[PDB]
Structure formats: structure tokens, C-alpha cells
Design a binder for this molecule. Structure first.
Ligand SMILES: *[C@@H]1O[C@H](CO)[C@@H](O)[C@H](O)[C@H]1NC(C)=O
Ligand SMILES: [Ca+2]
Lengths: 59, 82
């Protein structure tokens, strides 16, 4: 719905640590794992990275 | 970081100008680079590195479809993330 509470402007999205931040340093939550904004990441067979909040996996 | 004059020939790398366009030769190390006035990098390279040099200009093989083998070594469909 259209709820009531404490938000912050649209350019800013919420961080875990009480502040809200732009989507530049908005981490990824891949498989639960809280990856930092720049974490290149791969097993032998996959290839994955966190860009701006979304987790860009390939194969 | 020290700006040198031109031409220049240290360490087996003659740094010359040919046809009004700049050249960098490494015939001992098997390559010849150059640039034009507009700016168009070019790299001539021997047959010694056939199926060797893997990078941004791809391998020196015969094929042309398989010459995206990443720094891991992975045939990719995208010419961009490569
Ligand atoms: C290139 O070298 C690789 C690795 O040794 C080998 O697997 C492949 O068969 C070679 N390809 C050609 C065209 O020689
Ligand atoms: Ca090739």
C-alpha cells in the first residue's frame, strides 16, 4: 500500500547501518551473502559480480 | 615519467616516425606498433605467438569465433565484458 513512516528521497536507498545511500554503494545480497559494491567473484565454471545493488551472474 | 625527445632507441625499441606517422618497433621481441595522425592504433606481430598472445586483440589462431578467451579462459558470447 501507500504507507506512512520515515523514508528518504528517491535518489537515496536504505543501507543496513541506519543511513540511506545512493545506489552506487548499495551492496548485493546474493545467496544471503552481503557483498560490497565492487566484488568480482567466481568459481571455476560461473562468473559473477556486484555492480550497483544487482548481482550480475553469467556462466 | 621523464619526458624524452624523439626519436629514441633504448633497450632494443626504436621509436621512430614513418611516412609522417609514428612507429614503435620491437623486432627482437617480435612486434611493430604505430599510430596515425587521427589516432588509430595498429599492431603487427609475428607468427611466433600463434595460439599464444591472449588479450584484447585476441589470440593469433586461424579461427575468428573462439578468439574471446578471457583472463580466466572462458569462451564468451559478449564482446564487451571480455
Ligand atoms: C592452442 O593451445 C591450446 C592449449 O595448449 C590447445 O588446447 C589447442 O588445441 C591449441 N589450438 C591450436 C589451433 O593449435
Ligand atoms: Ca583469433
Amino acid at each position: 500500500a501507500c504507507l506512512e513512516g520515515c523514508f528518504c528521497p528517491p535518489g537515496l536507498y536504505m543501507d543496513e547501518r541506519g543511513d540511506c545511500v545512493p545506489k552506487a554503494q548499495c551492496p548485493c545480497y546474493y545467496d544471503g551473502e552481503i557483498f560490497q559494491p565492487e566484488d568480482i567473484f567466481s568459481d571455476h565454471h560461473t562468473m559473477c559480480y556486484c555492480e550497483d545493488g544487482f548481482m550480475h551472474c553469467t556462466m | 615519467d621523464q619526458r624524452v625527445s624523439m626519436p629514441y632507441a633504448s633497450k632494443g625499441l626504436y621509436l621512430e616516425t614513418e611516412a609522417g606517422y609514428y612507429k614503435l618497433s620491437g623486432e627482437a621481441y617480435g612486434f611493430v606498433a604505430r599510430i596515425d595522425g587521427s589516432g588509430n592504433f595498429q599492431v603487427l606481430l609475428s607468427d611466433r605467438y600463434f595460439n599464444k598472445t591472449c588479450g584484447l586483440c585476441g589470440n593469433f589462431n586461424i579461427f575468428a569465433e573462439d578468439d574471446f578467451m578471457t583472463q580466466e579462459g572462458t569462451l564468451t558470447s559478449d564482446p564487451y565484458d571480455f
